[PDB]
Amino acid sequence: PISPIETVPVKLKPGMDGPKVKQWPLTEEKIKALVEICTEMEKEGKISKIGPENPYNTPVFAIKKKDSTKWRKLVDFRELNKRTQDFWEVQLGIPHPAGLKKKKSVTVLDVGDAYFSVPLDEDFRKYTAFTIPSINNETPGIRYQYNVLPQGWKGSPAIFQSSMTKILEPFKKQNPDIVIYQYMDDLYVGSDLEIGQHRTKIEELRQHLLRWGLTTPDGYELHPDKWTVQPIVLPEKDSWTVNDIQKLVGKLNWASQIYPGIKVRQLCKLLRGTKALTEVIPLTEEAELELAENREILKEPVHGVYYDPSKDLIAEIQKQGQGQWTYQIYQEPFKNLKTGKYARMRGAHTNDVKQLTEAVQKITTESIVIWGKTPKFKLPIQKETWETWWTEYWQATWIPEWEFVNTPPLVKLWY
Amino acid sequence: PISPIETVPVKLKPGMDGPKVKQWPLTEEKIKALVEICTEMEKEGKISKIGPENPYNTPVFAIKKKDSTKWRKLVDFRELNKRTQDFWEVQLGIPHPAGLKKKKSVTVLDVGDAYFSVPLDEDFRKYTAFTIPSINNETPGIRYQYNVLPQGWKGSPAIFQSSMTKILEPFKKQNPDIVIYQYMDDLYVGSDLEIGQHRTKIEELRQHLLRWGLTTPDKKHQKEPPFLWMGYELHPDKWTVQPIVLPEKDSWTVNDIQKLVGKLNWASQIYPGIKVRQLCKLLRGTKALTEVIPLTEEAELELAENREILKEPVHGVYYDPSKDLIAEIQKQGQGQWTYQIYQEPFKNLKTGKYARMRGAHTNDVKQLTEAVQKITTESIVIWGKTPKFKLPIQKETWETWWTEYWQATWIPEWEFVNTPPLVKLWYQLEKEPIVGAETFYVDGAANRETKLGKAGYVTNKGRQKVVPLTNTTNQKTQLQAIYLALQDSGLEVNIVTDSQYALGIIQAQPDKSESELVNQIIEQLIKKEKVYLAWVPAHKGIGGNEQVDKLVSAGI
Ligand SMILES: C=Cc1cc(N(C)C)nc(S(C)(=O)=O)n1
């Protein structure tokens, strides 16, 4: 219910005002969902109607979870989070289980049903304002603010973290093998056991959470080992034209910003003079040395690349064509923490925005598992298109931040 | 009267203070028109003289105006407005006629006075004080203060609309089939009740309104087929917009103009092409809202084109939820796009012209896509669903494009409409270098100081060019050199550049561009049969590039 607890007071960062984010228009199917849902929530004291004396707002919308179901609210607290983010202690519980990424399987649960117990600090409620829109602006918007900890607030798993440790203590004892990481609204649960077993030790945890009053759905299956970084590789075919060598050189020249031992001069030697593109050039030994030499640096992973906790994680995506998408995750230019591809598209799926939406989620749950932080995305799409269609494929309870860019001619340098 | 609703609490801005703007009065004329309008309002309870003295103050420049012998007071809350807390705008836009459905009966009550019938936060009236002067250029004088939502105040439509949706909630509960929509002083009441029962609800509602201090006219406007809601004309089977006339007067008081921005941007939601983001500048700050202001060359131009768009009335049908929505787009005057949204042929709900253009170098397919998006957003906003599209483009033109575009794009469900000018790709670049083509090594250079440069090329057939340039920049000579190569070569050519800049633009495949130069390159591009553009790093001594570089470099 709403258990008699002292409201943990909370205060935005200094100098900063609460969110004032305009609301995106929603389809009718969605506005109905959000009207029902909020109606129940207001009945149960979870939220309250407010008037327009409250200048703050936060987008709302609705998604239809993973592998079908029936609607769910989702409040885009991005702006309020970064306006409130990491206060004092209570922060992201433990500095993230560095182990979890190693476990054979990881499963995800939606413990978000918690949070609706704990009241929210009086003087903060107003910063949680949110407004269900109206089709054709017929009725005014229906504004609610929160009274309990809200599902997407980041300040929520923080405040509730004392209690979740208690609830879980008994389970982690009877199971010191199994790793348990809370991020935002989900618990990431990773074992080493065999599928049938692991999936058993998950329900136990669901029932264990029930016996402490939490209640869950009734996410994904995740296999962290086997997230193999993708090493940059050079063309193999022998029959080099002046073109092939030119591409080759340009690429190695760029790739020399990542790996400092790479040399090009023996390949520029083969290209002296003003030759035509088509013209086949005999690969001299000294060159085929430099090329086998170089080929074998692009092999071993890099050194000098360590996560820096106080710095944002960035993530670039490039459309590669055949339903393939390449991405890299990094914190300063050219020092990649990970690089991967994502594919698996044909027929009843081919839809740039859909694939890009799926990749953005998968990349993001890789980051949560590997560092306990979501990456600020660089999306190869146009603001309008993306803002127009993303909530149609979203199935996750968090939302990473993102920017919009024009992919350079470096789609090439990765694949 | 004055509604008994509970007031909305209203704070002055974070660390701020009320308007202490002293009155600039004295006219000995019309200072009598006030105190008559005031002492009437003082009786209806809308204001009251302030006891224990001081302070704060707002102007009261009253303009009786050529309303045909009328006396009108006009508090200027412009400065109080800047100190009042922000409010949330709870609507995404003004409603659109086409978004209405057919109802057997509709009525449009005019809420009488309204802002004037909702009380003001008690603690906040103090800051709404004003003054009426007298003979003795000394107090004497007289000092009032508002008890109800003041006319120009910043919070008066937000608060008023909140007070109203409150007052109605009970009535909407007992009557779930009646639909009431509010918009300022107009209240639309649709229903599928027999003409007779309706009129009775409409009476029950007028009483509810009255018990809550809200009066609604019984002589009812001039209700013929033209029932008027929000300045639209609703007929059981169509809506029409009353062509707006923008009167030409040079008595353009700061007010009269301030009222023009209101009317014009109300119109832009019905009419595509209204610009008002210009003459707004004929304001900014506080400059006596009676001070006749002269038309500039910047605003008097556009306002002149405005009368032109509003010239021709607009109309359309109502929305029926059992049918899909179909949107059709056609290409017009290069970057000009027309579109219609309908459900039954020839029966349009809404038509428009989209122009915009996105970037400095665009093309037709991406430009179309932009329109398919804007139109999509519109459909969700007005009807909350997505339309099916008919488009001047071939499944295979779109197919090859997205499948060779580094960015990601997408259009919902669509159908080829074989129509006037089709949208097509005005050329394509080779993916491989062409065999037996003069391989052009291009390059330019500019001296950021003197602003001089050169652009030139070198081929694998001994052909060379170097052109001296005045007032260019590096990235401009990079495009210049590419142009040379294009124009001095056969139908089939291989160009090789070191400018990732120049390479970006060309690889996008623009057919229109901001820069004239890029156009000349565009022109040249389509005149060719086969073109293949290549990139290599500067200063690696790569054969060809190295020679061209040296050649154009008596600048570097
Ligand atoms: C100027 C504001 C305004 C406002 C308005 N509304 C809001 C109906 N209508 C007009 S009108 C009669 O010119 O179409 N103007």
Coordinates of N, CA, C and O and ligand atoms in Angstrom, one line a residue, chain B residues 94 183-186 228-232 241-242 244-246 258-267 270, ligand 1:
Chain B
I94 N -4.7 24.7 -31.1 CA -6.1 25.0 -31.2 C -6.8 23.9 -32.0 O -6.1 23.3 -32.9
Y183 N -13.2 26.5 -25.6 CA -12.2 27.2 -26.3 C -12.5 28.7 -26.0 O -13.3 29.3 -26.7
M184 N -11.8 29.3 -25.1 CA -12.0 30.7 -24.7 C -13.5 30.9 -24.3 O -14.0 30.1 -23.4
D185 N -14.2 31.8 -24.9 CA -15.6 32.1 -24.5 C -16.6 31.2 -25.1 O -17.8 31.3 -24.8
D186 N -16.2 30.4 -26.1 CA -17.1 29.5 -26.8 C -17.0 28.1 -26.3 O -16.0 27.5 -26.1
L228 N -21.5 29.4 -35.2 CA -20.1 29.8 -35.1 C -19.4 29.4 -33.8 O -19.7 29.8 -32.7
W229 N -18.4 28.5 -33.9 CA -17.5 28.0 -32.9 C -16.1 28.3 -33.2 O -15.6 27.8 -34.2
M230 N -15.4 29.1 -32.3 CA -14.0 29.4 -32.6 C -13.7 29.9 -33.9 O -12.7 29.7 -34.5
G231 N -14.7 30.7 -34.4 CA -14.5 31.3 -35.8 C -14.5 30.3 -36.9 O -14.0 30.7 -38.0
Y232 N -15.1 29.1 -36.7 CA -15.4 28.2 -37.8 C -16.9 28.2 -38.1 O -17.6 28.6 -37.2
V241 N -14.3 28.3 -43.2 CA -13.7 29.4 -42.5 C -14.0 30.7 -43.1 O -13.8 31.0 -44.2
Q242 N -14.6 31.6 -42.2 CA -14.9 33.0 -42.5 C -13.7 33.7 -43.0 O -12.9 34.1 -42.2
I244 N -10.8 35.8 -43.4 CA -10.3 36.9 -42.6 C -9.9 38.1 -43.3 O -9.1 38.0 -44.3
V245 N -10.4 39.3 -42.9 CA -10.0 40.5 -43.6 C -9.0 41.2 -42.7 O -9.3 41.5 -41.5
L246 N -7.9 41.6 -43.2 CA -6.9 42.3 -42.5 C -6.9 43.8 -42.9 O -6.3 44.2 -43.9
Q258 N -0.7 44.6 -31.7 CA -0.7 43.5 -30.8 C -1.9 42.6 -30.9 O -1.8 41.4 -30.7
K259 N -3.0 43.2 -31.4 CA -4.2 42.4 -31.7 C -4.1 41.7 -33.0 O -4.8 40.7 -33.3
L260 N -3.3 42.2 -33.9 CA -3.1 41.6 -35.2 C -2.3 40.3 -35.1 O -2.6 39.4 -35.9
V261 N -1.3 40.3 -34.3 CA -0.5 39.1 -34.1 C -1.4 38.0 -33.6 O -1.3 36.8 -34.0
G262 N -2.4 38.3 -32.8 CA -3.3 37.3 -32.3 C -4.2 36.7 -33.3 O -4.3 35.5 -33.4
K263 N -4.7 37.5 -34.2 CA -5.6 37.1 -35.3 C -4.9 36.3 -36.3 O -5.5 35.3 -36.8
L264 N -3.7 36.7 -36.7 CA -3.0 36.1 -37.7 C -2.5 34.7 -37.4 O -2.6 33.8 -38.2
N265 N -2.0 34.5 -36.1 CA -1.5 33.2 -35.7 C -2.6 32.3 -35.3 O -2.4 31.1 -35.2
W266 N -3.8 32.8 -35.1 CA -5.0 32.0 -35.0 C -5.3 31.4 -36.4 O -5.7 30.3 -36.5
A267 N -5.0 32.2 -37.4 CA -5.3 31.8 -38.8 C -4.3 30.8 -39.3 O -4.7 30.0 -40.2
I270 N -5.4 27.2 -39.7 CA -6.3 26.9 -40.9 C -5.6 27.2 -42.2 O -5.7 26.4 -43.1
Ligands
LIG1 C1 -7.1 37.6 -32.8 C2 -7.5 36.5 -32.1 C3 -8.6 35.7 -32.6 C4 -9.1 34.6 -31.9 C5 -10.1 33.9 -32.4 N1 -10.6 32.8 -31.7 C6 -9.8 32.2 -30.6 C7 -11.8 32.2 -32.1 N2 -10.6 34.2 -33.6 C8 -10.1 35.3 -34.3 S1 -10.9 35.7 -35.8 C9 -12.6 36.2 -35.5 O1 -10.2 36.8 -36.4 O2 -10.9 34.5 -36.7 N3 -9.1 36.0 -33.8

